[PDB]
Structure 1
């Protein structure tokens, strides 16, 4: 059923060209706030733990999270597909992690800020209620900084949740990074393509860029890119079964949230801040130098670098 069980981006983040399966993430929840997720996909069904809808007339709506788009299923599979109970499917970064599929985007792929904020807060409340470590993964954003979403991100971060979000796809000009990625309390993820330039992976032209003034210090302020990951031509799970290939910072984001789950499960006593620091240090150690604006060190195209296993 799968054309590649181990897509290029999984090999890249594992730094293993002959990787045959992934591992890790046990006990960590990845809340994928997206268009929903195909709950019966062979390669996701073993990890589905929550399924809630934030787009309806009351909220949350439990036991409802249907993907009619594909985007949410695709993102989920990059983070945590497990190969299926027959080992014949695709593997994501953290195949032992739990999936919380929170539908915050309509089937069109666009969502309302109040719904997104509600889901961010709900994920935090569920982390607190269950006593379990949770990563919010948001393959979405806007050029504008909505205060409902910002305040929700702060609330979640205060509860110990890690927030990972797409940089956006409005690049490559300076200052195109969107929100919630551009928030100080969110990890903004840039997209790499499977091309080398200047001896490293290359940032995709579409990936939104941060700002010159605050890049370079390896400390995240508002507007800074943080971590790069594979985003172009990413094969993953799809909403009506099977698989598909799509591109974007949306695809890069779950590589990072999956990596974060893998690291957190290896090191489960870490706070969210400590986990963030570990991820930042991983990225720093793999400097990205390819693509417009990319430079030696921390830069506004690729942030700190490419965090790998």
Structure 2
């Protein structure tokens, strides 16, 4: 059923061209705030743990999270598909992690800021209620900084949740990074393509760029890109079964949230801030130098670099 059980981006983040399966993430929840997720997909069913809808007339709506788009299923599979109970499916970065499928985007792929904020806060409240470590993964954003979403991100970060979000797809001009990725308390993820330039993976032209003034110090301020990860031509799970290939910072984001889950599950006593630092140091050790604006060191195209296993 799968054309590639181990897509290029999984091999790249694992730094193993002959990887046959992935591992890790046990006990970490990845809250995928998106268009929903296909709950019966063979390669996700073993990890579905929560399924809630934030787009309806009351909120949350429990035991409802249906994906009619594909984007949310696809993102989920990159983070944590497990190969299925027959091992014949695809693998994501952290196949032992738990999925919290929170539908915050309408079937069109667009979502309202109040709904997104509500889901960010609910993920945090569920982390606190359950006593379990949680990563919010947001393959979404806007050029504008909504204060409902910002305040929700702060709330979650204060409850010990890690927030990972897409940089956006408005590149490659300076200053195109969107929100919530551009928030100080969110890890903004740039997209790599499977091309080498200057001896490294290349940032995709579409990937939104941060700002010159605050790049270079390996300290995240508002507007800074943080992690790069595979985003172009990514094969993953799809909403009606099956698989599909789509591109974007949306695809890069779950590589990072899955990596973060894999790292946290190893090292499960880390705070969110310590986990964040571990991810930053991984990235720093793999400097990205390809693509417009990319440079030696921390830069506004690729952030600190490409965090790998």
TM-score between the two structures when normalised by the length of structure 2: 1.00
- Per the TM alignment, residue 143 of structure 1 is displaced from its structure 2 partner at its CA by 0.1
1-side partners of 2:302 and 2:200: how far apart?
Answer: 11
RMSD, aligned CA: 0.1
Residue by residue, what CA displacement relative to the aligned partner does 1:221-274 show, whole Å, maximum 9, x if unpaired?
000000000000000000000000000000000000000000000100000000
- Per the TM alignment, residue 150 of structure 1 is displaced from its structure 2 partner at its CA by 0.1
- Per the TM alignment, residue 161 of structure 1 is displaced from its structure 2 partner at its CA by 0.0
Q: Provide the secondary structure at the position in 1 that maps to 2:306.
A: coil
Residue by residue, what CA displacement relative to the aligned partner does 1:202-235 show, whole Å, maximum 9, x if unpaired?
0000000000000000000000000000000000
Q: In structure 1, what is the equivalent of residue 194 of structure 2?
A: 194
Residue by residue, what CA displacement relative to the aligned partner does 1:249-304 show, whole Å, maximum 9, x if unpaired?
00000000000000000100000000000000000000000000000000000000
1-side partners of 2:25 and 2:132: how far apart?
Answer: 12
- Per the TM alignment, residue 13 of structure 1 is displaced from its structure 2 partner at its CA by 0.0
Residue by residue, what CA displacement relative to the aligned partner does 1:108-149 show, whole Å, maximum 9, x if unpaired?
000000000000000000000000000000000000000000
- Per the TM alignment, residue 107 of structure 1 is displaced from its structure 2 partner at its CA by 0.0
2-side partners of 1:121 and 1:256: how far apart?
Answer: 21
2-side partners of 1:230 and 1:241: how far apart?
Answer: 23
Q: Count the aligned residue pairs.
A: 309
2-side partners of 1:160 and 1:216: how far apart?
Answer: 27
| Over 2 Å off, 4+ runs | none
2-side partners of 1:182 and 1:286: how far apart?
Answer: 22
1-side partners of 2:188 and 2:210: how far apart?
Answer: 10
- Per the TM alignment, residue 58 of structure 1 is displaced from its structure 2 partner at its CA by 0.0
2-side partners of 1:90 and 1:168: how far apart?
Answer: 26
1-side partners of 2:4 and 2:19: how far apart?
Answer: 11
Residue by residue, what CA displacement relative to the aligned partner does 1:145-187 show, whole Å, maximum 9, x if unpaired?
0000000000000000000000000000000000000000000
Q: In structure 2, what is the equivalent of residue 96 of structure 1?
A: 96
TM-score between the two structures when normalised by the length of structure 1: 1.00
- Per the TM alignment, residue 51 of structure 1 is displaced from its structure 2 partner at its CA by 0.0
1-side partners of 2:181 and 2:85: how far apart?
Answer: 34
Gaps of 5+ in 1: none
- Per the TM alignment, residue 66 of structure 1 is displaced from its structure 2 partner at its CA by 0.0
1-side partners of 2:274 and 2:132: how far apart?
Answer: 16
2-side partners of 1:270 and 1:293: how far apart?
Answer: 33
